[PDB]
Design a protein around this ligand. Structure first.
Ligand SMILES: O=c1[nH]cc(Br)c(=O)[nH]1
Ligand SMILES: [Br-]
Length: 242
């Protein structure tokens, strides 16, 4: 059981707490998890505003049913404006404008998934609730400063460890969606014999017209799930956000 003051305790779902215990353990990388906490404490002591709020840092785990896990989607680091990120890759709180990448994800869903209707909001929590782990590599960011915790925080080693541990030890066969070169680097952590890895170009505008549009990753994900006897994702999102 982690000796951390507060960070491990933010993992509130018991199944995930137990599953992740060998990573949050003090022994993992000889105190690495504690060092992530200490980093976040020091940034706060410096007066830095760190996002998302503590209670959302591990929302990808807390909101995703452990035994129902079937899809893993990787992101880079959280959105960095106030009151925007909430602990799931690509998702934003309601009443926030859609970021460009998310607009493009909605565009592709609209052409790929027959009958999909994009909402005006960007809140993706209903996907997580179905069994889709929406994991950023880096789980915090300083306000307004993209990538600010990527090299300094230690999170990437943690989330790399999570990916490997899921690959090796999750009870279910899983579909990993790897969008862009950063995410695709994680393929080497994943047993592509047991699990299914679907790689595509990233949806941000810089790349989107070079292979994102038309890639049909959402239908491909569902075909993969169906072949593995999983319940497919229900991609339609509530048109009113909670
Ligand atoms: O949370 C996230 N939002 C947007 C991007 Br792009 C990302 O990598 N992660
Ligand atoms: Br974006």
């Amino acid at each position: 059981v982690s000796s951390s003051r507060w960070l491990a305790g933010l993992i509130t779902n018991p199944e995930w707490r137990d599953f992740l215990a060998p990573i949050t353990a003090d022994s993992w990388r000889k105190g690495a998890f504690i060092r992530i906490e200490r980093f976040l404490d020091e940034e706060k002591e410096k007066g830095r505003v760190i996002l998302p709020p503590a209670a959302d840092i591990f929302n990808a785990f807390n909101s995703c049913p452990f035994r129902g896990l079937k899809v893993v989607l990787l992101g880079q680091d959280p959105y960095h404006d106030l009151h925007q990120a909430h602990g799931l890759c690509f998702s934003v709180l309601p009443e926030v404008p859609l970021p460009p990448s998310l607009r493009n994800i909605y565009k592709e869903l609209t052409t790929d998934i027959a009958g999909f209707q994009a909402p005006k909001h960007g809140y993706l929590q209903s996907w997580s609730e179905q069994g889709m782990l929406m994991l950023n590599a880096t789980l915090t960011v300083e306000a307004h400063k993209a990538n600010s915790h990527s090299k300094t925080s230690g999170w990437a080693a943690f989330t790399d460890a999570v990916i490997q541990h899921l690959s090796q030890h999750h009870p279910n066969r899983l579909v990993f969606l790897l969008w862009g070169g950063y995410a695709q680097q994680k393929k080497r952590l994943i047993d592509a014999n047991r699990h299914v890895v679907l790689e595509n170009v990233h949806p941000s505008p810089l790349s989107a017209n070079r292979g994102w549009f038309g890639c049909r990753c959402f239908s491909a994900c569902n075909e993969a799930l169906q072949r593995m006897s999983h319940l497919p994702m229900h991609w339609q999102l509530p048109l009113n956000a909670p």
